[PDB]
Amino acid sequence: PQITLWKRPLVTIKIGGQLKEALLDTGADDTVLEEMNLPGRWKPKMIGGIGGFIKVRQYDQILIEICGHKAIGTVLVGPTPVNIIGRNLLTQIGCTLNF
Amino acid sequence: PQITLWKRPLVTIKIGGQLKEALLDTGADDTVLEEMNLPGRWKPKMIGGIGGFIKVRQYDQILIEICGHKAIGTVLVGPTPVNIIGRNLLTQIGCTLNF
């Protein structure tokens, strides 16, 4: 599909067996999800943006389904105010910017 | 153009007569640029990101050219980690997400 940017580009995703709303975010290197209790091993990480840094948990090889398009990669979990789909998964679903 | 996302979507912009590099950021409502001198009046404002809120200078109706496309709108100037072009100007140049 084609998503205009009049409004936040929020879409439904499926991760860890849950449905959630997330931003398709070309400004995010990595994918960052709101606090959730995923199983498996993780590594601590810190990621920075406007206002400073937050501490997140890095999970690897996590399956996410974005508007029916499957993707698998690194997902960061932490106290973000919004679920963010970053470029590491946007490339996997064939997402491009066009103007 | 069609921009893929295996690399950061960095582009050259012209603002206040000066060339700068900026990130096309579909996850940003607003356009926030690093500290710089801009002509015209401004008002203090606050904006929040992943790490908290910062103080910015708000310049309204600023001319800004993004890869040869003209936009005129609000530009926030402050301690952002990177120059970001948000949806308020991405819409003006006709940018959409496609997958």
Ligand SMILES: CC[C@H](C)CN(C[C@@H](O)[C@H](Cc1ccccc1)NC(=O)O[C@H]1CO[C@H]2OCC[C@H]21)S(=O)(=O)c1ccc2ncsc2c1
């Ligand atoms: C340094 C480049 C930008 C700031 C990076 N950000 C993604 C950006 O889309 C962010 C994503 C975001 C969106 C909403 C709340 C918090 C973060 N939006 C944002 O900060 O926008 C601000 C400016 O417009 C306003 O509207 C939204 C907030 C304001 S981010 O969320 O901090 C982010 C995401 C993944 C990531 N991986 C490594 S670093 C890193 C940083």
